[PDB]
Structures are given as C-alpha cells and as structure tokens.
C-alpha cells in the first residue's frame, strides 16, 4: 500500500536554565527509526529500528550533522519568535516542526508537507502545491516574506519530491521484512453486566500494525455512533497497537449489535456479534 516518511521536531526554551531541550524523531509509516535528544550522552542521531543499522558510518555522521543544524535553527527561531510576539525572555516557549512525504503503492511521490508551529498553534505551513505558504497571522507573514525571498519553497520542493522519496524507498526496501508487513488485529468481545437491565459490550482490537484502524458499532446493521465510548488508538510498546470501542445496550438485545473492524491487514472487514 501507500507509505510515508516523517520527521518531527520539538524545541522547548529554558531561559537561564540551559540550552533549549531539542527532541527529533523520524518515522517510516508508524515505525520510528531514528531519534536525537539534546539531553542524551551520544549527541548523535541514534537508531530506533533494527533495519536502520544497515546504513553505514557516513549515514550517522551526516544525520548527526544535519540534525544539529536543525537544533541550531530552532534555537535562533525561539529568540526571533519571542520578539515577534513581544514576549518576555523569562518564559518557556515551544517550537514544533513536522515534514515528510507520501508515496503510493508503486513508491512514487504522492504528496509532501512541511509544517511549523509556535506554542502549540499553526504558525506557518507549506501548502499542498509546495510553492506557497499559509501564514497563520501577522507574525507568520514576516516569515512568509522572508522565506519567499530566500526561495525556501524551492528547497523544500526539491527535497520533498526527490530526496525524501528516494530515501523512503531505500528504507522501505531495507526494512521490507517488517515495514511491508501487516499484522491483522487479534479481536474479541467482552460482555459485562452494568445496570440491572443493561449490559456493556466492548470490542477489542489488539496486536495490529499499522496503527490505522476503524471500530464501528451497528445495531440491526445501522451505525450506532451516539451511545458508545471509543478510545484513542494506543501503542502496545512492542511495535503493535491497540484500541477498543464499547456500547451500553439493553440486556437481552445484545444479538442486535455488531462490531465492525476495518484494518488493511484483513482481506475484508470483520463482523463480531457477542
């Protein structure tokens, strides 16, 4: 199926306490493969996926160098942004950045993106065409104007439509064994009496990958989306994911409800009846 490579960057200022905390992570779909943490002892980009060790010595040297350059840019920006919003130098502020690319089943470029945020809100993002910018407010406009003159869009486009895709393929191949695998969810249903005349049915999905999944309850074949509780898909810690969805139903009418599980790891969606 389709695939993506994405990098996430976070810088938190600590005025007077130390350098801003800088954390970066790289992903191929839902699999993290590298990380950098300014508080760590290595001060190098580190591996987080077995297959990334297939890369050579120059890879680690280069990615360490580049990631430190990102850290430096984030450090300057924190200052710049503080000024733009006329904020005090004592407070702690955040800068987040995410960029990457998507490829189809043939592993050819589909889309690219580069987003930047300040204190948890959109600040500026590269639009879908990879040639223009969406500036959140008046502050972002100044950066927009700066980045147009410096032809930043052009740099990002070349990377997003080329380098990003090239490496994503490379990683996809080296990690074929696992990245191109689909772990269909192991599912079951629990029936637990709650009220005196009501029962709760919880639909479980476990040990699946990628994290993308859909659990929907139906009654007599009709979607029931207003008497249910859905949890945020969560990481099992071993590479797989988990999720569950429940609905309170009238005791004795359980046979009317069905849980539908959609996951690319399944030939066809699963229908579960207690």
């Amino acid at each position: 199926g389709s695939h993506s490579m994405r990098y996430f960057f976070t810088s938190v200022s600590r005025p007077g306490r130390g350098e801003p905390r800088f954390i970066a992570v790289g992903y191929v779909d839902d699999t993290q493969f590298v990380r950098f943490d300014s508080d760590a002892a290595s001060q190098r980009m580190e591996p987080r996926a077995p297959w990334i060790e297939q890369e050579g010595p120059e890879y680690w040297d280069g990615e360490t160098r580049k990631v430190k350059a990102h850290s430096q840019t984030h450090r300057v920006d924190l200052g710049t942004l503080r000024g733009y919003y006329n904020q005090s130098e004592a407070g702690s502020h955040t800068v987040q950045r995410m960029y990457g690319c998507d490829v189809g089943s043939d592993w050819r470029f589909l889309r690219g993106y580069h987003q930047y945020a300040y204190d948890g809100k959109d600040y500026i993002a590269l639009k879908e065409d990879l040639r223009s910018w969406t500036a959140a407010d008046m502050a972002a406009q100044t950066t927009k104007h700066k980045w147009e003159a410096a032809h930043v869009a052009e740099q990002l486009r070349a990377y997003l439509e080329g380098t990003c895709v090239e490496w994503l393929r490379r990683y996809l191949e080296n990690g074929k064994e696992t990245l191109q695998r689909t772990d269909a969810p192991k599912t079951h249903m629990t029936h637990h009496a709650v009220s005196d005349h009501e029962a709760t049915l919880r639909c479980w999905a476990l040990s699946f990958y990628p994290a993308e999944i859909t659990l929907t309850w139906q009654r007599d074949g009709e979607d029931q989306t207003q008497d249910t509780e859905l949890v945020e898909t969560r990481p099992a810690g071993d590479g797989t994911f988990q999720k569950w969805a429940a609905v309170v139903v009238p005791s004795g009418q359980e046979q009317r409800y069905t849980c539908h599980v959609q996951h690319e790891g399944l030939p066809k969606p699963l229908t579960l009846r207690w």
């Binding site: 976070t10 943490d37 955040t94 945020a117 919880r202």
Partner: protein, 100 residues
C-alpha cells in the same frame, strides 16, 4: 498561550495473566506544553525501572508519550499511573483495569 490537559490510558502490552511477566503501560496524550511528570505506581509507591518513548506529537500539535516498565501481574498487587501537568491542580491517578 494554549493548554491541553493530558488524556490517560493505563494498560498492559499483552493480555494480563498472573505470574507471567508483562509490561505495564501508561500512555499520556493530547497535552501541551510538553513539560509533564508521569509515574507508574505499584501498591501506591512509585517504580524507578520506568522508561518512556521519545517525545512526539499529533496533527493538532498535542504531545504524547508512552511510559512503560516490565512487571508481573498478581492478584494482590495494585498498579496505576500518576500524572502531573500544569493544567492539573491535583496529580491524577488512574488505576490499571485488566479489562481496559
């Protein structure tokens, strides 16, 4: 300056079975700023063999982290997750429920 209180889910990596080692997880998400304190409690007291994933965030820019530690579920031992955050006036505790 926005602020989002953290969502919390306490659970195990594999289906619980007393006597067999597993991994106790505490997944905190949807929070902001990133500064956050998370502890896994065993019978009220905190564990120190605790670890966490690298800081990352969702499309809405809200952060998420996974705190975990190896352990063996028993019938008398009680576990939970203690989370403290700027948006919280009182450290929130979420006991681990085997069926959730």
């Amino acid at each position: 300056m926005i602020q989002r209180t953290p969502k919390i889910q306490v659970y195990s990596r594999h289906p619980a079975e007393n006597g067999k080692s597993n991994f106790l997880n505490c997944y905190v998400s949807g929070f902001h700023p990133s500064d956050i304190e998370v502890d896994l409690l065993k019978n009220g007291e905190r564990i120190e063999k605790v670890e966490h994933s690298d800081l990352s965030f969702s499309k809405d820019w809200s952060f998420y982290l996974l705190y975990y530690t190896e352990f063996t579920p028993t019938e008398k031992d009680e576990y939970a997750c203690r989370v403290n955050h700027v948006t919280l006036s009182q450290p929130k505790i979420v006991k681990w429920d085997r069926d959730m």
